[PDB]
Amino acid sequence: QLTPTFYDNSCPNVSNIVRDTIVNELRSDPRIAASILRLHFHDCFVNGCDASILLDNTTSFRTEKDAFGNANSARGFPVIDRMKAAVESACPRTVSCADLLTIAAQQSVTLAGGPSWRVPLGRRDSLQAFLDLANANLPAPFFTLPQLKDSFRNVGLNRSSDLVALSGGHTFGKNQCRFIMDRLYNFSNTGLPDPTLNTTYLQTLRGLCPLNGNLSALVDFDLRTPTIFDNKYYVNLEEQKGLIQSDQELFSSPNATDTIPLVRSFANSTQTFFNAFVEAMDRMGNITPLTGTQGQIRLNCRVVNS
Numbered sequence: 110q111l112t113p114t115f116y117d118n119s120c121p122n123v124s125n126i127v128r129d130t131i132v133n134e135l136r137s138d139p140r141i142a143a144s145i146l147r148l149h150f151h152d153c154f155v156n157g158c159d160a161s162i163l164l165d166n167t168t169s170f171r172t173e174k175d176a177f178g179n180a181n182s183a184r185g186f187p188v189i190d191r192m193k194a195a196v197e198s199a200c201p202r203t204v205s206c207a208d209l210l211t212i213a214a215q216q217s218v219t220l221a222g223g224p225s226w227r228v229p230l231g232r233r234d235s236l237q238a239f240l241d242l243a244n245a246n247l248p249a250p251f252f253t254l255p256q257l258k259d260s261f262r263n264v265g266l267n268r269s270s271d272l273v274a275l276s277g278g279h280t281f282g283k284n285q286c287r288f289i290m291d292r293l294y295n296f297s298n299t300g301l302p303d304p305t306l307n308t309t310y311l312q313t314l315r316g317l318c319p320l321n322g323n324l325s326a327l328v329d330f331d332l333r334t335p336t337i338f339d340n341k342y343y344v345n346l347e348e349q350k351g352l353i354q355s356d357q358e359l360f361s362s363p364n365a366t367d368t369i370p371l372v373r374s375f376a377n378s379t380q381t382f383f384n385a386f387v388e389a390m391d392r393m394g395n396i397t398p399l400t401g402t403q404g405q406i407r408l409n410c411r412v413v414n415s
């Protein structure tokens with residue numbers, strides 16, 4: 110089983126090295142904390158948190174970086190390489206890329222103002238990447254609530270609290286116009302905007318993402334505190350200001366009887382949200398890990414050891 114003390118003897122300073130790397134990167138890229146948390150999420154939803162997402166292409170298997178949910182979206186890979194190299198220098202062949210990314214995600218959340226906790230450790234690295242599985246398992250912004258729930262349950266997270274709390278990751282970070290164009294101009298072939306999108310916010314978003322405009326333009330997930338990890342994300346949902354369809358459905362879907370109370374509870378108390386986020390994060394981080402002698406302690410997160 111995974112344990113927070115896994116490296117307390119072999120690499121006591123791993124968390125500090127990870128933190129230092131992120132602090133340094135944040136000075137030039139304020140979006141990196143968000144990007145790193147998302148990398149961990151996309152790692153865990155595909156064959157578990159096994160650093161499979163970090164692997165590059167080989168002639169035998171395709172990289173998950175070309176999955177619909179990762180291509181021209183997932184970022185921060187060089188930063189992970191940097192901290193990995195630093196950790197390898199401090200403690201040779203000790204910390205797995207899977208664990209490194211987990212610590213990076215937690216440190217990223219804390220650095221952005223979120224809760225601080227010690228993540229369970231002991232994960233090992235995959236011997237292959239899973240592009241098809243990534244295309245099948247990663248949720249999409251156009252998913253209905255039932256589909257979002259299906260996606261989470263498919264990887265092992267049965268609880269609505271898992272879905273609602275982890276969606277809080279959208280309390281910071283960026284989103285491309287491409288993913289909300291339907292909500293803004295033609296939702297579900299209705300020829301009208303998504304009725305669950307606040308009409309005042311609708312105008313603002315249309316200004317940032319005009320029809321036939323730059324689909325790659327970036328918009329903040331959280332209009333209240335774009336780069337701070339806090340519970341404002343849920344306050345937005347209550348006002349119909351969730352940015353993407355999957356955000357707003359947590360509060361407005363006909364199937365949201367179970368998620369609405371969670372959204373309200375997280376909007377009403379930072380402590381309630383933070384506690385639930387840590388609980389959900391550790392649950393996601395416990396998805397089908399390779400442990401013991403399974404897999405490897407990858408030296409270069411981009412390639413399997415040979």
Ligand code: HEM
Nearest residue numbers: 143144147150182248249250275276278282283284285355
């Ligand atoms: C519930 C289903 C989810 C869907 C459909 C979803 C969808 C997306 C989409 C469309 C983007 C924008 C990517 C881009 O424009 O390049 C994104 C970004 C992001 N997501 Fe989610 N997401 C989900 C859950 C989560 C979870 C569970 C976390 C982490 C706990 C997370 C963390 C993030 C972060 C922090 C970003 C910003 C990354 C950056 O700015 O580099 N997401 N997500």
Ligand SMILES: [Ca+2]
Nearest residue numbers: 152155157161
């Ligand atoms: Ca994975």
Ligand SMILES: [Ca+2]
Nearest residue numbers: 280331334337
């Ligand atoms: Ca925020």
